[PDB]
Symmetry: D2
């Protein structure tokens, strides 16, 4: 009962930006152009490229593809997901206010809380999953609302169309949705009212655990020109090879995400059936408080499964150490299955008190279910939970 899948997604992921007529050789795969500079027929009159930081063939090809997958007009690539957040923040000026989602990636919390706040910006963390709390927190100085859905790691879900309703009542407020967890194959924030669709491409977009990159998709002409200026002026740009490698991962995004769905759902149901699991948070399960909201704004779910182990910190540790197929490591969205304890690793940059209020306890385990065989993944979780029973 999910949203119908996006129509030409697979065809566009393979061909947008990959036109052979772009190259003299008519190659079917875009070449990796490392050249920092380009010949000009006259001072200031180039043939499309002046300097790699401002633009280069391999990066523009990637931006073209991601924009199409997001239903966007424009896209911008950056050195990392955080670098995209920083560049987006530079759209503002001293005196502006930012409303940020309550549960967000540790680095996003760390940046807003400890860095951006020191340059004339007020940061307010609000649980926008309760949509009235967002409306109450908006102020005449609010210029940017930063949303994750599902949130990392508690996986709270936010009505994007509802928030866009509210946020756009006050005129000039930018709504950003960090769509890293879902990918554009399952959720298109721009089609739901958002002004900016942002990704940590390190996770699902690239999907091969070998490229650190951020992506930002936008439709507004004014908003794109401002973001493009900061891409060149701040210089947090990605390598053209990383762009090629990321564009390479997009070619299989559709088949990868579909398998993440099946394996993730199978893992979530198994964990809810386990006598040694206290709670399971997965947007695809009916037990999720926003399950029905997911189906109206998403075409499916991913392999990100969060759950609470029964017991204490030492039971969580024992489970993670007895894993033989899941790998104890940070990050997510790759072909290999990964397991982690956010309170001690990825979300240790969040204040401990803020962890407790959010539920990020010592027993919260986050899983990034990969593309391995289903029964092998379930046999690994079973043996490791039994080890920690």
């Amino acid at each position: 009962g999910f949203l119908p899948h996006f129509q030409h997604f697979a065809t566009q992921a393979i061909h947008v930006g990959q036109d052979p007529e772009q190259w003299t050789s008519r190659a079917v795969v875009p070449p990796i152009s490392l050249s920092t500079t380009f010949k000009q027929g006259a001072p200031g009159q180039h043939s499309g490229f002046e300097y790699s930081r401002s633009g280069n063939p391999t990066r523009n090809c990637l931006e073209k593809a991601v924009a199409a997958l997001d239903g966007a007009k424009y896209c911008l690539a950056f050195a990392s997901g955080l670098a995209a957040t920083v560049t987006i923040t530079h759209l503002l000026k001293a005196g502006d206010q930012i409303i940020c989602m309550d549960d967000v990636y540790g680095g996003t919390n760390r940046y807003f809380r400890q860095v951006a706040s020191e340059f004339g910006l007020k940061i307010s963390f609000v649980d926008c999953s309760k949509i009235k709390l967002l409306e109450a927190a908006i102020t005449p100085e609010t210029k940017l609302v930063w949303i994750e859905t599902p949130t990392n790691p508690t996986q709270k879900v936010i009505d994007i169309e509802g928030c866009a309703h509210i946020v756009h009542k006050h005129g000039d407020i930018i709504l950003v949705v960090d769509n890293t967890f879902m990918s554009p194959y399952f959720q298109r924030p721009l089609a739901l009212g958002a002004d900016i669709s942002m990704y940590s491409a390190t996770k699902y977009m690239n999907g091969h655990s070998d490229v650190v990159m951020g992506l930002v998709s936008v439709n507004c002409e004014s908003l794109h020109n401002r973001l493009r200026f900061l891409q060149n002026s701040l210089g947090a740009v990605p390598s053209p090879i990383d762009c090629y490698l990321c564009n390479r991962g997009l070619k299989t995004l559709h088949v990868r995400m579909e398998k993440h769905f099946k394996n993730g759902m199978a893992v979530a149901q198994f964990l809810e059936s386990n006598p040694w699991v206290e709670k399971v948070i997965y947007p695809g399960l009916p037990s999720h408080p926003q399950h029905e909201l997911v189906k109206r704004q998403c075409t499916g779910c991913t392999g990100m499964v969060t759950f609470y182990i029964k017991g204490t910190l030492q039971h969580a540790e024992i489970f993670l150490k007895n894993l033989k197929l899941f790998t104890l490591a940070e990050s997510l969205g790759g072909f290999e299955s990964l397991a982690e304890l956010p309170a001690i690793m990825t979300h240790a940059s969040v204040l401990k008190n803020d962890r407790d209020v959010l539920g990020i306890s010592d027993t919260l385990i986050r899983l990034s279910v990969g593309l391995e065989d289903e029964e092998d993944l379930l046999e690994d979780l079973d043996q490791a939970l039994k080890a920690a029973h």
Copy 2:
């Protein structure tokens, strides 16, 4: 009469951070580690690496090498030179003031003037080549002094130790020297009092016109920890492959820069003796107003040659179009020779009024002399100058 060359430079550029025993294969060249994450034996108990953005083998190898070449204790790599400038600015707080050299790369001027100033920072452009003009502009809110030497493109030279004397006289003020034009083989700002040695690694460090990268070297422990926090928190980090490629270019930095010196000097002398060149700005020529300061502050000179062609824009254009070996393009520091007209291209982001005050006119041409054969470079300039003045 230049400074004696820095000892062990070549050996360190080839071996620092390149320890074969680091790898199970015991390879002599460090592998390219693309992995975004690393397996941990226990929650939070890694093997040296947690996440690629925080750190990764190939990037750490590069940073160590640069640190040794700069005589620094630590170094940080970034996605670009500007990204290093932005990260350095984030060391400050709203209300602080930045003093920037009046003549600087257009993008540096653009960032400070149009971006950093909008976040509670006041920017003042002052001619720190006159070292007393800097002393007058310092205020209790001054936290950062950003200088280029030689400046881009006018190539004004600044007594780094002189500025360091003044700057450190007022307590907690950071002195940054953008050492892009000279490279550590010819100038070590840290040994001259500077607090931060910063590079656009896109130019000479990599030296192969195929990597966009910035580098920041530092000695102060407090200053390093704050920069490292911002490297991971702002995430303007370079690709591990770019890190490998840049470390690859470092291996020939010493032999590349020496040839840049010879070709650059030969081009400057040819242009100075040319009847259709009004003036030549090259730190290696005695005609440069700060020549003796250069020999006092550098072990040599670079391939960056600036000069004024005789006539008007119309002659500047024609000269550039008749070039057959020099390439009309932006950037610099590569093995290939490059020519440009800053007022319209790299420094078009600078306001015309400040361009005029700085001397960046329609006849100022900037050359990045490459590693081609000397005779071919001089014949291309000769043929192009004659073409512009028949």
Copy 3:
């Protein structure tokens, strides 16, 4: 009614040879080791590597993975598919005989006929699809039988178990199966009696149209030692980067091949019911003469679809140029859909007389169906066939 899928394929494709414990950094993805040489603890006493051509970390990791996907003990990577064919041919001696499948890739035909024959080797092309023709052609000097199944481009299918029975009655004959068209996810020649499972990894193994590489899997110890000697001695070795890129593509082989199956079947059925197609050759259709052998010998089929257009050379040409999503080009097995005219392009190296005997006519069109959206692929073929008629 196909063979049941191979157990643990996906798990092995993602993890075999990728153990993080190999690296000091504990990286989850193997690094790309470009170093040509390695430090030795003593003159001639290495720690596993002395020189890149003999072996290097990134290549050895890939070989382990491919061997597992083939169920093999050993695997060897090469600079190209032909480079693997040449290296295998060097296993023999002057005076030996080679029996090659009559319908084979043009370059493979060119090598045996025009090169290997000039160095004391007798080459015999036999229709091994009739198993008695192989038995009749075996000679006391026969040392190598080289088979493709399905063949390129006519896609004749060969009973691997039948040929192994025949070939191995005579003692010292090597049976090679070029498994390029099927990939190890759908066909395991080694489990069916073959002595060597060989691939042009340029096609499906890498699957991203950006790596030229060959792979050879083997079980026999004597046969492996002889091949390993020639890998280092002939030096037709691949770059460690290409090895990394190919190993990256292997991680999604299972999900890619499943989509190739679905898209290939849909395209093959559409063409067979098309009024401007005289004949369709697809192992997955019941109309294929060896359909029942395919289901007995394969777990599925791929996106390689061959068909004869009705009319003349001019109708094939017009059809091929009016394709707007399929790309007219050589090669196959990538995420993008490809079309070609073998008689003029990939198989122009086969003698015209031999083309007619094999059926490689001016109206035979070969398709490599990619992973694009199904309806877009069928709509591109529909509009292009009308354009020709």
Copy 4:
């Protein structure tokens, strides 16, 4: 008093094949084109590229550059130096004869001796440094003469122009010069009568110890077409990235080779004056038996320094081991200094009887002097010789 340096060498190494107008972007550095295939406007009507193995932009750019540096009309790149040797051998036919230099790289001797000889080719090893023995050994079946100069590792020098005179009196005999040790910056075999200038590009050509590659430069039109046919037909082709990396190393060949000369000479003079060195073989020293011949055909010398340690095998082992800056490893020609004992390491593939007759004894040490600071390289040799006395 050497030959004058080759004119326009540096300019050509930086610009030949690197023309920005080749690319729509007008990039100053050629892009890395990984695409295996290319779009064709009509069946068999390409725009210069059909399939990566036959040709691709990044490889063709490299081939143009090397050809110019060799003073050649054509150049062909291969997966390795041995792969280039194999491809050149396939130029012949069963019944032909090969004359190979008596002292040659272990792998080159091993290939001819143990592989090529098994396919209807007779191999004859002759000391062509004494030119009368070459004239005597030629036979009506001789079709190819293969020389190294300086030889590896004894570094005997061969009058290339003299041998070309002899071999070309007998009509259709190919003269190959493996110019690996000298690089085209110091020796141009083609300008001295050779028919083929061949390189192991892994050594000085690339010069960064991270690319395994072979190169062959030729002037004869018939000979080039035959080699080009075999490049595509045997498929021992290099990766396009390796081609880019090798072309990148070429840009600094001139400045690298000059420093190898200076450091090599200083090391050769130091070791010859060292009380615990029995002999020093360096083409640049007056003590070299063919020193005056070197100055006749070369513009300079390299960092390859061979010498005999005074004493026994055990002193050579200890010497290699106490080096703290030189690295004990195989290969040569990189920016880093390398030490090895060929009799057991690189030349262990040569038969002992042939080793003893050639002088490759247990006390012969081969050094590849890098680009490190001269004074540090000389104490590394000083301290290590002191330790072994």
